[PDB]
Amino acid sequence: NLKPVDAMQCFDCHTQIEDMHTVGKHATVNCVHCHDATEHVETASSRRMGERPVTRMDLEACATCHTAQFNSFVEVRHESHPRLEKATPTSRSPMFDKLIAGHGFAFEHAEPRSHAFMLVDHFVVDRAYGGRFQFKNWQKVTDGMGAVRGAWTVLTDADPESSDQRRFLSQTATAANPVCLNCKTQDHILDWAYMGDEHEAAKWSRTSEVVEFARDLNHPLNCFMCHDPHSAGPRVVRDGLINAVVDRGLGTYPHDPVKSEQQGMTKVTFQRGREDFRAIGLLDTADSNVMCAQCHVEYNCNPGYQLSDGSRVGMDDRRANHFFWANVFDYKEAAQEIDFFDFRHATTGAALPKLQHPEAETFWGSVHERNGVACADCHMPKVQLENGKVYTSHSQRTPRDMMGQACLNCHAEWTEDQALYAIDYIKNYTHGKIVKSEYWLAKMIDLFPVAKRAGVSEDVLNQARELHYDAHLYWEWWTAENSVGFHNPDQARESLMTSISKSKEAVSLLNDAIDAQVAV
Amino acid sequence: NLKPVDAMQCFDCHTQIEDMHTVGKHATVNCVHCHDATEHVETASSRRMGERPVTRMDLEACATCHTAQFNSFVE
Amino acid sequence: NLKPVDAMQCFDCHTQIEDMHTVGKHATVNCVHCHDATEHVETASSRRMGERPVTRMDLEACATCHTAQFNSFVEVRHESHPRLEKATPTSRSPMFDKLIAGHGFAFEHAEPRSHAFMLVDHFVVDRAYGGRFQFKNWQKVTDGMGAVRGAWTVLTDADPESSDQRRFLSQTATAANPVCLNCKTQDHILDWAYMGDEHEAAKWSRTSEVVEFARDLNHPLNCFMCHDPHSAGPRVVRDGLINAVVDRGLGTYPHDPVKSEQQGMTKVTFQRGREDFRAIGLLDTADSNVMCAQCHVEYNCNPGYQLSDGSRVGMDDRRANHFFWANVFDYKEAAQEIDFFDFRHATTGAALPKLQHPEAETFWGSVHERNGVACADCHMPKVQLENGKVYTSHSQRTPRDMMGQACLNCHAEWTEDQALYAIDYIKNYTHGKIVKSEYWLAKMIDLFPVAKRAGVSEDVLNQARELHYDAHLYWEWWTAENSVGFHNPDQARESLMTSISKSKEAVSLLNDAIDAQVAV
Amino acid sequence: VACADCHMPKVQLENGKVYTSHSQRTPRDMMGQACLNCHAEWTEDQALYAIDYIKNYTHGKIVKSEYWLAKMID
Numbered sequence A, C: 001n002l003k004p005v006d007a008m009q010c011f012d013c014h015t016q017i018e019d020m021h022t023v024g025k026h027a028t029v030n031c032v033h034c035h036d037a038t039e040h041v042e043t044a045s046s047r048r049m050g051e052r053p054v055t056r057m058d059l060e061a062c063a064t065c066h067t068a069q070f071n072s073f074v075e076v077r078h079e080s081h082p083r084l085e086k087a088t089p090t091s092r093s094p095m096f097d098k099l100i101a102g103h104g105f106a107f108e109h110a111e112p113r114s115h116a117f118m119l120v121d122h123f124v125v126d127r128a129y130g131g132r133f134q135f136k137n138w139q140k141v142t143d144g145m146g147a148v149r150g151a152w153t154v155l156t157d158a159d160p161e162s163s164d165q166r167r168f169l170s171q172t173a174t175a176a177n178p179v180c181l182n183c184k185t186q187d188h189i190l191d192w193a194y195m196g197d198e199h200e201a202a203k204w205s206r207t208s209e210v211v212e213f214a215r216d217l218n219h220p221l222n223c224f225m226c227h228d229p230h231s232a233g234p235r236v237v238r239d240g241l242i243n244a245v246v247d248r249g250l251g252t253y254p255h256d257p258v259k260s261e262q263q264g265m266t267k268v269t270f271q272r273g274r275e276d277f278r279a280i281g282l283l284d285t286a287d288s289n290v291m292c293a294q295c296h297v298e299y300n301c302n303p304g305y306q307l308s309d310g311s312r313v314g315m316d317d318r319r320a321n322h323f324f325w326a327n328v329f330d331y332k333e334a335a336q337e338i339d340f341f342d343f344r345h346a347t348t349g350a351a352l353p354k355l356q357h358p359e360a361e362t363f364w365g366s367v368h369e370r371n372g373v374a375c376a377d378c379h380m381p382k383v384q385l386e387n388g389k390v391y392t393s394h395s396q397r398t399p400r401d402m403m404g405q406a407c408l409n410c411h412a413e414w415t416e417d418q419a420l421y422a423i424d425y426i427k428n429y430t431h432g433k434i435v436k437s438e439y440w441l442a443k444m445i446d447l448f449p450v451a452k453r454a455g456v457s458e459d460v461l462n463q464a465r466e467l468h469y470d471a472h473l474y475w476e477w478w479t480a481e482n483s484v485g486f487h488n489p490d491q492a493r494e495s496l497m498t499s500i501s502k503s504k505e506a507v508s509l510l511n512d513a514i515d516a517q518v519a520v
Numbered sequence B: 001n002l003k004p005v006d007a008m009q010c011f012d013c014h015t016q017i018e019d020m021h022t023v024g025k026h027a028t029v030n031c032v033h034c035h036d037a038t039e040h041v042e043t044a045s046s047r048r049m050g051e052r053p054v055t056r057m058d059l060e061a062c063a064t065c066h067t068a069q070f071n072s073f074v075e
Numbered sequence D: 001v002a003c004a005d006c007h008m009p010k011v012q013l014e015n016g017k018v019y020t021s022h023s024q025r026t027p028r029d030m031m032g033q034a035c036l037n038c039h040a041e042w043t044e045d046q047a048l049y050a051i052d053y054i055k056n057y058t059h060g061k062i063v064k065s066e067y068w069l070a071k072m073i074d
């Protein structure tokens, strides 16, 4: 049974923690629930750690007093199809392989499933670790609670004796790197310096061997990613988000200075040896838009290349951990701002960006966002009870499963079927434009080998490659973004029409150049 | 927000509660969750209650940390 | 009303039948239930047949004493979509036409439906008989009981006056031949010599006019295909299976000599004029893996060509009736063993194999097979009754329709939704690799015309054709096999990755050769 | 067996931390957890049928007990 420790004795050294803990809703929650610090207390000084105290990162540290939120969080939505490859005619991007050729995502890119699995899914996807990690057997794929208890309780490593990234099966890639983990877990929150910079007090950084890092990590989406464990107040912990909002002064709502002021973020920094080490961002309000934007954004978390001279940008560069914090129409400028692109297309040779799930940046400026609606209103609403203490659902999922709480409470004029029909109208229309965008991208891509072999000039191929960048960006934003346009249908429509326009321009350029070569 | 009280000071006069509280699974659950004893502490001796402290009997005193049991109960 | 005949009088000549009938669970079942032999008894000698007795092949011969098994067998699963072409974006092989071009399956290849329809579906598919046979009208497609009563009660022949295979509609093929029928019916069991060899006592053989043969056949999947009608004991009757297991000594479980001994097969031969004529294989146990492997295997049942010299292998050759009895990683060697391939790809000119529904060979070595699980456990389990005599379901169908009996009885740790989710995880992942395999095969195939027209050498095109064989095999196994990887997910994954690897190798070979030609 | 086994059993979750139901009610609302876990030989309808056989028989004897009490009282 837990025995409380004397918190005043801790606070003698830990004034920041004292200021947070004594004022918030965890003022009565003793340190022993999450820390074992006995030897630490015996050996620390005011400025030196002494023996390192143990800190619990497991979600069950919160489940004892908040069982309802924990149980809701770990639920598995079986209707969210698992391991469903997006590059197929019946999923999000029928022509993904041709369009993304040259990028690691061609090796596998499945649709998202329930949050319980995020860390295990990261470890087992074919593009990440060369097939090194697998579930212990194919039955463990169902075990959300198990994954939450710890990735290594349900996974196996094909070679515990080596720590290099390599292929264990032929059609895999080794794209994982330590930055990825920041959107899967924060078990390393005390072992990672802000941004993953090299730091004397950090065991792990952007330049770590990712297989060794992986082995030290266990829990998905820790409860404390949105909730400070000391104050119980709302926060974010993701360095890339704090860097965009605070360091770069862009604000929580870059398009709305007023809302940014009302719903802002305060950066709090913790030191090691009186040098800045790690940071969190306390939120003015419990604003799920910013909490969910710790992960549901477009980012760099990988090496790449410079647009200016084509040279390599490695994990050691700060650009390998970057939140663009830009909507689709500002993205190209944001990538120019850091002089960066992701890969060269295998067929066209164009410098291209790789876009990832930009839900937060898409939602900006939408009718719902402009009316003060936030991700949680549609995806983790309050539970409605005939008799009971209300709490907030923590099962983040499509609103189709709770339409009464997620839509119909605001849209009293609609039945559930009418609301679903409205969502499907947008998704059907947006998906048709994604498919047409891919058709035109594919037609362009197919012309590159023909043009090269017909002797079309480098100057013309380069003009086409410049068109490819835009045609790609204005399409791939939408296959990466998970709402199939629902989060911002006018923007999706404008962007996809721009993609098509750019592809058509490139097709015309290439056809005319091929025809001129043939005619000579 | 609740502010914890010095449970050790209570135990100087409440050995019977001490022997139950320190040993069980509520050893870390501060008295402030269920008692308002400020004036009691100001006025009591080990042999004189002084001001009567308040004791919460409401089920919500438990529902804060045990919402699932409470919600299932009130259905 | 049936009057019993004196079986002792039969047994005077038929000692093999006596030995089987008197010992098994049909010892009380009189010959008159299945044979009308009066004139036969009057005219036969110990070695000459005399007048030929009538033998009932219809399933209703068993339905009078086994109504529950019959009724379960003839049920139509309406959820198993009928006449659903596999070569479409929403079915098993979106790029099948490009990949299989040159083969008769390009004319039509639908998904399987309920067993009641196997013989009628064989007769009406566009690739089989030139469109000669059709249902009497489009309504008869629902009539499972009717098909069981007899194919000719629900079908019409466009020209009863001719017996040649020819096209009656432009986009059909005439791929059917007498070997096919052995996996649709055994009405011909007394009229077909072992392997379909020419034989004095056989009306039909591999070299028969298949339209005339077709007209003599009526019933699907006769009950006696798995059950000896004399002993009632478990057996197989399919010659190609007996030949692989017994004649070729490969065993019922080629990878497991022990299990092969415990669950073996005894070949019993019947003679005509004291010459071997036909054979059955009595099973040591009621082993559905081997019963279902009478049909759910990869086979030859068609003419083809020799790998060594390209020469024609016709229906007259024993290789036209062949069970490879090899898993996907042993198949190429099994085809080399008989010096055989199926067709030349219409675009690449590569010699290619044609793979068919290899469920039995895929299941070998899987976790379930290694634990003693068999096809019937998942696809035709015991019926569970609150009060009743238990019998075995004979409706062979997906376990999704009876998850309590087909999965959850062994997997007590799972709910139905969890079990379904586990199946779908494997199928989704496997299907994504099928789609990626087709993408890479298609990319290679598309390069052949470009390479030929650019003047790439025959030597390079031949190297690519050799890669095509493997790229094809390691893909097509999985579109042919009906479990979308569930029967052996690790093997499917390894094979599909091999397919992709081979295609990629061929693409690189061809691109480099085209580029070199252009550069000259 | 104790009252809680039939009237406030542990909750069964595909994924989650087990806790004890505190909704003290008839087992008819949670037959999987309140009966069928120990009575593997039964379906839900069989277990309900066994309950009802007892209650029907008992209620008949209650009614007959009242009939005779009332006859005496009159």
Ligand code: HEC
Residues within 6 Å of the ligand: A005, A006, A007, A009, A010, A011, A012, A013, A014, A031, A035, A037, A038, A040, A041, A044, A045, A046, A047, A048, A049, A052, A053, A054, A055, A190, A271, A272, A273, A274
């Ligand atoms: C002064 C003598 C201290 C007392 C008493 C306690 N801690 Fe401490 N702690 C101290 C230092 C100088 C450091 C390094 C960071 C800094 O602020 O300079 C720490 C570190 C921690 C940590 C972080 C551990 C990690 O893995 O990075 C935790 C969780 C921690 N301390 C907790 C803690 C608790 C619960 C205490 C009372 C039981 C406590 N500390 C006493 C200095 C001192």
Ligand code: HEC
Residues within 6 Å of the ligand: A025, A026, A029, A030, A033, A061, A062, A063, A064, A065, A066, A223, A224, A227, A229, A231, A232, A233, B064, B065
């Ligand atoms: C019991 C010993 C607790 C443990 C362990 C944790 N929390 Fe807690 N939490 C606790 C209480 C008594 C309260 C106040 C209840 C009230 O409504 O007065 C809380 C409150 C929260 C809140 C709400 C904060 C707010 O609204 O300002 C959050 C978000 C919260 N707690 C989260 C949380 C997390 C993430 C934990 C694990 C790291 C956790 N709590 C542990 C009691 C206990």
Ligand code: HEC
Residues within 6 Å of the ligand: A077, A080, A111, A112, A113, A114, A115, A116, A117, A118, A119, A121, A122, A182, A183, A184, A185, A221, A225, A288, A291, A292, A293, A294, A295, A296, A375, A376, A379, A380, A396, A397, A398
């Ligand atoms: C990084 C730690 C994340 C934070 C914070 C949030 N989400 Fe998330 N989400 C994340 C990942 C890595 C995944 C995929 C998990 C996998 O194993 O595939 C997801 C998934 C979702 C989904 C899909 C769920 C489903 O049923 O398929 C939704 C609807 C979702 N995420 C929404 C969401 C919301 C609303 C958040 C703020 C409350 C949120 N997520 C935070 C990574 C992270």
Ligand code: HEC
Residues within 6 Å of the ligand: A108, A109, A110, A111, A112, A113, A121, A122, A123, A125, A127, A128, A175, A176, A177, A179, A180, A181, A182, A183, A294, A295, A296, A297, A298, A299, A300, A301, A302, A356, A357, A480, A482
């Ligand atoms: C936060 C900015 C993220 C970083 C850095 C990484 N990922 Fe991620 N991932 C993120 C979210 C919000 C989601 C769910 C939404 C979606 O569109 O998928 C995911 C999902 C995954 C998945 C499951 C889906 C799939 O693509 O198969 C995997 C396997 C995954 N992520 C792997 C991954 C790797 C290898 C990363 C570093 C290169 C990486 N992620 C970074 C959010 C974030």
Ligand code: HEC
Residues within 6 Å of the ligand: A059, A062, A063, A066, A069, A070, A073, A221, A222, A223, A224, A225, A226, A227, A286, A287, A288, A291, A292, A376, A390, A391, A392, A393, A394
């Ligand atoms: C961000 C992606 C979150 C993670 C991870 C966790 N929770 Fe949460 N929590 C979140 C939001 C947006 C809210 C609602 C805030 C509002 O006022 O609208 C909550 C709320 C809580 C509470 C308060 C009581 C309630 O409303 O339910 C508690 C006690 C709480 N959350 C606990 C909790 C635990 C235990 C988590 C890990 C399982 C957890 N939260 C994760 C956002 C986020």
Ligand code: HEC
Residues within 6 Å of the ligand: A080, A112, A288, A289, A292, A293, A296, A359, A360, A363, A368, A373, A374, A375, A376, A377, A378, A379, A397, A398, A399, A400, A423, A427, A482, A483, A486, A487
């Ligand atoms: C209601 C007004 C919404 C707000 C605010 C947000 N999202 Fe959303 N989201 C919404 C719908 C109607 C859909 C389509 C769901 C469907 O079933 O068709 C989505 C989709 C998602 C997804 C994918 C969900 C899935 O299909 O499994 C994710 C990952 C998602 N949305 C995330 C998300 C985030 C992070 C938001 C705040 C920035 C957000 N959504 C706002 C409805 C609404």
Ligand code: HEC
Residues within 6 Å of the ligand: A028, A064, A065, B025, B026, B029, B030, B033, B061, B062, B063, B064, B065, B066
């Ligand atoms: C948060 C500050 C709490 C309040 C207020 C109450 N309880 Fe509690 N309880 C709490 C914790 C952290 C634990 C230990 C959890 C663990 O498993 O380690 C408990 C435990 C219980 C138990 C189980 C005791 C046992 O198994 O021996 C019960 C029955 C329980 N608590 C009941 C309870 C009641 C009735 C309360 C109101 C008077 C109450 N608790 C308040 C945290 C908190």
Ligand code: HEC
Residues within 6 Å of the ligand: C025, C026, C029, C030, C033, C061, C062, C063, C064, C065, C066, C223, C224, C227, C229, C231, C232, C233
């Ligand atoms: C009634 C006159 C029968 C006809 C016609 C057929 N069968 Fe039969 N069968 C019959 C009896 C009385 C029994 C024994 C019942 C018992 O359990 O003792 C059987 C048994 C079978 C079995 C089980 C064999 C075994 O387990 O060893 C099978 C597989 C079987 N019968 C099949 C069968 C078939 C395929 C028939 C048509 C060719 C058929 N039977 C006719 C009674 C009668």
Ligand code: HEC
Residues within 6 Å of the ligand: C077, C080, C111, C112, C113, C114, C115, C116, C117, C118, C119, C121, C122, C182, C183, C184, C185, C221, C225, C288, C291, C292, C293, C294, C295, C296, C375, C376, C379, C380, C396, C397, C398
């Ligand atoms: C040759 C005589 C066969 C034997 C012996 C078995 N099966 Fe079969 N199966 C066969 C054919 C020709 C077809 C397609 C029928 C058509 O008209 O399309 C099938 C079909 C199945 C199916 C699909 C049923 C559906 O609902 O779609 C299953 C699940 C199936 N077969 C399984 C099966 C099992 C388990 C067997 C051993 C008990 C078995 N079959 C024997 C041909 C033959």
Ligand code: HEC
Residues within 6 Å of the ligand: C108, C109, C110, C111, C112, C113, C121, C122, C123, C125, C127, C128, C175, C176, C177, C179, C180, C181, C182, C183, C294, C295, C296, C297, C298, C299, C300, C301, C302, C356, C357, C480, C482
């Ligand atoms: C046993 C070794 C078989 C031989 C010889 C033939 N077929 Fe077949 N067929 C077989 C099975 C087990 C199944 C169901 C499983 C599946 O993958 O389809 C089938 C199915 C058919 C069907 C329906 C499905 C379709 O392809 O449209 C048809 C029309 C069919 N089979 C025709 C056919 C022809 C023309 C054959 C000789 C060339 C032939 N089959 C042989 C098992 C066996």
Ligand code: HEC
Residues within 6 Å of the ligand: C059, C062, C063, C066, C069, C070, C073, C221, C222, C223, C224, C225, C226, C227, C286, C287, C288, C291, C292, C376, C390, C391, C392, C393, C394
């Ligand atoms: C192989 C593809 C089969 C065909 C065709 C038929 N049946 Fe069958 N039967 C089969 C199996 C695998 C079993 C179970 C054997 C075991 O012990 O597990 C059965 C069983 C019977 C029985 C026995 C009683 C029972 O278990 O139901 C009877 C009487 C029987 N089968 C009859 C039967 C009839 C009448 C058929 C044509 C409609 C028939 N079987 C086809 C496998 C096969």
Ligand code: HEC
Residues within 6 Å of the ligand: C080, C112, C288, C289, C292, C293, C296, C359, C360, C363, C368, C373, C374, C375, C376, C377, C378, C379, C397, C398, C399, C400, C423, C427, C482, C483, C486, C487
């Ligand atoms: C359970 C452990 C199984 C055993 C043993 C066998 N099969 Fe199977 N099969 C299984 C599943 C879960 C599936 C996918 C079904 C779904 O609905 O997703 C299949 C599929 C088939 C099919 C196609 C069925 C359909 O979708 O209509 C066939 C023709 C099939 N399996 C045949 C088969 C044979 C002949 C087996 C023994 C060699 C066999 N299966 C074993 C589960 C299991």
Ligand code: HEC
Residues within 6 Å of the ligand: D001, D002, D003, D004, D005, D006, D007, D025, D026, D027, D028, D051, D055
């Ligand atoms: C399972 C073996 C039981 C145990 C142990 C206890 N009870 Fe029960 N109870 C049981 C049944 C099947 C029924 C009839 C319910 C029905 O729907 O027909 C009952 C009934 C009650 C009731 C009335 C409940 C109602 O119908 O709403 C009460 C108040 C009740 N039982 C209380 C109770 C107590 C206090 C027990 C322990 C001493 C107890 N029951 C044990 C099944 C079981």
Ligand code: HEC
Residues within 6 Å of the ligand: B059, B062, B063, B066, B069, B070, B073, D004, D018, D019, D020, D021, D022
């Ligand atoms: C007697 C009629 C009870 C009342 C009133 C309350 N609870 Fe209870 N509780 C009861 C039993 C029989 C059990 C299970 C004991 C066992 O181990 O079998 C419980 C359990 C708890 C627990 C432990 C965690 C769990 O098993 O759920 C907690 C935290 C708990 N109970 C809390 C609780 C609260 C908050 C109550 C008022 C709403 C409450 N209990 C009433 C019996 C009784």
Ligand SMILES: O=N[O-]
Residues within 6 Å of the ligand: A164, A165, A177, A208, A209, A210, A211
């Ligand atoms: O790839 N090295 O972590």
Ligand SMILES: O=N[O-]
Residues within 6 Å of the ligand: A356, A357
């Ligand atoms: O790949 N995760 O964005």
